[PDB]
Design a protein around this ligand. Structure first.
Ligand code: ZN
Lengths: 157, 753
């Protein structure tokens, strides 16, 4: 910073030299070692952390069909609630690298037929899921699937 | 007596499976360089085509060569020297591997040859015509000319003088042969021709020279119904190409089939070879079935003019998977046979053999019976011996590097004197040549060291004063290496090993000077410098420096600053050695061997000329008197030591008056440093008979260059060539090249002494 440019200029002059480690040795070694003293004497862990704090009211497990040990995964959900009636079990679709991507869900229109209650459930699904934000976790979709059953049961009752 | 050295094994490399296995072959250099391979089939094909080179002291830092090939290597051979290689395989694809820049782990091959649609059944090099005879009967001859004299085999096709040509020939699997010869220039001449009208399948063959540059070859179709034809090679280069004439020799049929009892036993031929290379009058022929094998020796002794005849066979054999030949050249005399039979001396009579079970057996070369028995507790694919055959390596169907140390003793009771004499002959076998002799230092006992070094002390004598001009370095290194194994002299080998560096640096700087005008003509200024040093034992030097022809020694005034460090070092090891008086010591032998001190007297008188001429190149030492020209009073001390050492065989302990004056040395001068060469990085201080060490690869169970005196850092960057013989860092790329000494670097441009 002030009066150190001989030390700075010596190393740039002595750089790209093969005798560098020996030139510095020859010019420097006896000065410090004399006075100052002598020398001394399967599944990724993302889903494993995801399912850890999932609700016990879901019993989601893997799909028995489709491919396995690959990038894309599918989880079929089980709902055991005494409050809510029976519905189709629903199945998701999550590709590889589950963080920072937006997954999908299967489509089967005829499974929710023979009852306008199931059609209202499907319409509520198309209402709630279309405004869900990007890159969200599976808890948001699971809970929006869970609340719509009560939201349709109150209209049915 | 049989010893097992070690097994060096990679981790997660063995258990080759799910593949048709292949028999393997091995090769060895003139030097201690094993070239080997293994069949793996691990998600690539080149692992089967892989080349492994192992230097004989450090079995971990292996040199790897990915020899790319379309068909797997079948036969592997070296050159007669250690400069060329061959990796034989089907449909040509043969190269020429030359050594790269004198390293330990660098090869290249930019040339070679190839044949299309024709695998090769036999191949051999050309001939040199140089050979001597070994006489174990002449152990007390006391002359190298008697024990080692040339037999003078005829060199093959000597053109432009007595130099035999360089090249190789091969017999293909079909009715076709090829020849490729290297010119004295860079060009190569290759020819290929049908061997006869009959073109056919050839299961086995062999190639062997005859006296006069001609070659006799063998045939084996494998149909077990054809005669075993023999052909001759007539070398004739008709002004553009080597036109070769072929003719049929008197052939042979096969035995063990005309007895009519059982003839379709052993239904296919499995082995057909000559006993030894370069000679074609003795044929091994072995047929192996799925159970056993039967072996026959055929001899071309004249009674047809060329008729083959049976020799011998042992009791029983298994399926042979590996076979080799002994390599030590006994003079093939029956007196040598008898004097090697009464004493336990069999280094060149054992054909190597192996079976499909865990057993190691030799067979005697002349008489085909089982001479030795050992049990391994695998089918050996190949073995690979040494020239002395004191040690060998074996390749079974695993990655285990079984290295076995044999000996001619066998356990039949050899006395101590016969233990001296059996090893002394093979010591003289390697001291007469510029060879490598690591395998014969193995079986040395600690008590054997004192007995054998005393013999080697007189082995430097009894030669006619001209061999001893340059083999002094080799014998100094020889007793440097052999004294390492003894615990009493392992503290003394530093004296030998540093003296190798001292004699390496001594003579090479005594050639840079030259008289610009000649003084004392018809002789060098060096001898006059020697005589003025040995005639003036003066205490001081200022009286001396008048009559030293001061006007003769003139330098170029440029390399004196470059060569400072060496002249910094040679006067500093003296500075340590003056303080070793008041002390088996690693500097104790220099107190009685004043030849090094005589060279120290000789070197400094010309250095003082430059010290008074250009004092900027003077070696700066660490005295506590910076204005004191202490070199005169150190001339005083070295002359005081010299009058205790210039006597012819003095054996004189220097007096305590010198000791107290050397106790005045720490008042000014303190020991800077040392460099003990004998760092035992080799397996000399790691193994033991009946105590092998199962080695691995790459586990390896203040950094200053050993050659040049340039100090580096804690973990330096500059690369080195591996001086494998003693582990000194022969560093590769010298810092100064435009102003460099051209012999002190070039003397060990190849290897260390
Ligand atoms: Zn060395």
């Amino acid at each position: 910073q002030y009066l150190c440019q001989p030390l700075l200029d010596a190393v740039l002059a002595n750089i790209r030299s093969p005798v560098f480690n020996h030139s510095l040795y020859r010019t420097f070694v006896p000065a410090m070692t004399a006075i100052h003293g002598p020398p001394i004497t399967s599944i990724p862990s993302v889903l494993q952390g995801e399912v850890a704090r999932l609700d016990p009211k879901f019993l989601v497990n893997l799909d028995p069909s489709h491919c396995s040990n690959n990038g894309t995964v599918h989880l079929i959900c089980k709902l055991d609630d005494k409050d809510l009636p029976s519905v189709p079990p629903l199945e998701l679709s999550v590709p590889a690298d589950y963080p920072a991507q937006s997954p999908l869900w299967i489509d089967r229109q005829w499974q929710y037929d023979a009852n306008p209650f199931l059609q209202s459930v499907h319409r509520c699904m198309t209402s709630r899921l279309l405004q869900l934000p990007d890159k969200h976790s599976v808890t948001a979709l699971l809970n929006t699937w869970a609340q719509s059953v009560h939201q349709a049961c109150l209209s049915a009752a | 007596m049989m010893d097992l050295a070690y097994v060096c094994e990679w981790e997660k490399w063995s258990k080759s499976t799910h593949c048709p296995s292949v028999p393997l072959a091995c090769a060895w250099s003139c030097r201690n360089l094993i070239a080997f391979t293994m069949d793996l089939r691990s998600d690539d094909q080149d692992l089967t085509r892989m080349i492994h080179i192992l230097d004989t002291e450090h079995p971990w830092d292996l040199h790897s060569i990915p020899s790319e090939h379309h068909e797997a290597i079948t036969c592997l051979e070296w050159d007669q020297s250690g400069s060329r290689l061959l990796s034989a395989d089907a449909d040509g694809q043969i190269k020429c591997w030359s050594m790269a820049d004198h390293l330990a782990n660098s090869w290249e091959s930019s040339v070679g040859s190839l044949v299309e649609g024709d695998p090769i059944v036999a191949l051999s090099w050309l001939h040199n015509g140089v050979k001597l005879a070994l006489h174990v009967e002449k152990s007390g001859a006391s002359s190298f000319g008697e024990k080692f004299s040339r037999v003078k085999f005829s060199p093959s096709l000597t053109l432009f003088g007595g130099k035999p040509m360089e090249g190789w020939i091969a017999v293909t699997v079909s009715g076709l042969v090829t020849v490729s010869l290297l010119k004295p220039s860079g060009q190569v001449l290759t020819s290929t021709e049908s061997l006869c009208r009959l073109r056919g399948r050839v299961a086995l063959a062999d190639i062997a020279f005859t006296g006069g540059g001609n070659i006799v070859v063998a045939t084996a179709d494998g149909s077990s119904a054809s005669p075993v034809q023999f052909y001759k090679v007539c070398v004739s280069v008709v002004s553009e190409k080597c036109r070769i004439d072929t003719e049929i020799l008197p052939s042979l049929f096969m035995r063990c089939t005309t007895d009519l009892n059982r003839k379709d036993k052993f239904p296919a031929i499995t082995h057909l070879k000559f006993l030894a290379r370069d000679m074609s009058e003795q044929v091994l022929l072995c047929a192996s079935s799925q159970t056993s094998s039967i072996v026959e020796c055929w001899s071309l002794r004249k009674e047809t003019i060329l008729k083959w005849r049976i020799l011998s066979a042992t009791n029983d054999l298994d399926r042979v998977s590996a076979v080799a030949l002994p390599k030590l050249p006994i003079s093939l005399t029956n007196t040598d046979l008898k004097v090697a039979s009464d004493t336990q001396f069999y280094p060149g009579l054992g054909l190597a053999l192996a079976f499909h079970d865990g057993s190691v057996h030799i067979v005697h070369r002349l008489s085909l019976q089982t001479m030795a028995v050992f049990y391994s507790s695998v089918h050996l694919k190949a073995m690979q011996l040494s020239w002395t055959s004191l040690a060998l390596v074996g390749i079974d169907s695993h990655g285990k590097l079984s290295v076995l140390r044999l000996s001619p003793s066998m356990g039949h009771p050899l006395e101590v004197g016969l233990a001296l004499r059996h090893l002394l002959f093979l010591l003289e076998y390697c001291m007469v040549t510029g060879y490598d002799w690591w395998d014969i230092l193995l079986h040395v006992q600690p008590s054997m060291v004192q007995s054998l070094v005393e013999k080697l002390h007189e082995e430097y004598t009894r030669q006619t004063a001209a061999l001893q001009q340059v083999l002094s370095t080799r014998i100094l290194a020889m007793k440097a290496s052999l004294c390492k194994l003894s615990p009493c002299t392992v503290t003394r080998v530093c004296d030998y090993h540093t003296k190798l560096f001292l004699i390496a640096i001594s003579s090479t700087l005594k050639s840079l000077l030259r008289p610009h005008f000649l003084n004392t003509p018809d002789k060098s200024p060096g001898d006059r410098l020697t005589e003025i040093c040995t005639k003036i034992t003066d205490v001081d030097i200022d009286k001396v420096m008048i009559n030293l022809k001061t006007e003769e020694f003139v330098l170029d005034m440029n390399t004196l600053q470059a060569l400072q460090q060496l002249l910094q070092w040679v006067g500093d090891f003296v500075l340590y050695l003056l303080a070793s008086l008041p002390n088996l010591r690693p500097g104790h032998s220099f107190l009685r061997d004043g030849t090094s001190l005589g060279m120290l007297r000789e070197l400094m008188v010309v250095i003082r000329i430059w010290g008074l001429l250009k004092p900027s190149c003077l070696p700066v030492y660490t005295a506590t008197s910076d204005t004191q020209d202490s070199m005169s009073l150190l001339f005083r001390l070295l002359t005081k030591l010299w009058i205790c050492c210039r006597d012819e065989g003095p054996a004189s302990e220097p007096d305590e008056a010198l000791v107290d004056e050397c106790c005045l040395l720490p008042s000014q001068l303190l020991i800077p440093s040392l460099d003990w060469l004998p760092a035992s990085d080799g397996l000399v201080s790691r193994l033991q008979p009946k105590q092998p060490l199962r080695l691995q690869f790459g586990r390896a169970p203040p950094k200053i260059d050993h050659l040049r005196r340039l100090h580096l850092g804690a973990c330096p960057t500059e690369e080195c060539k591996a001086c494998t013989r003693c582990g000194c860092v022969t560093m590769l790329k010298s810092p100064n090249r435009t102003t460099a000494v051209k012999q002190w670097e070039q003397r060990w441009i190849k290897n260390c002494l």
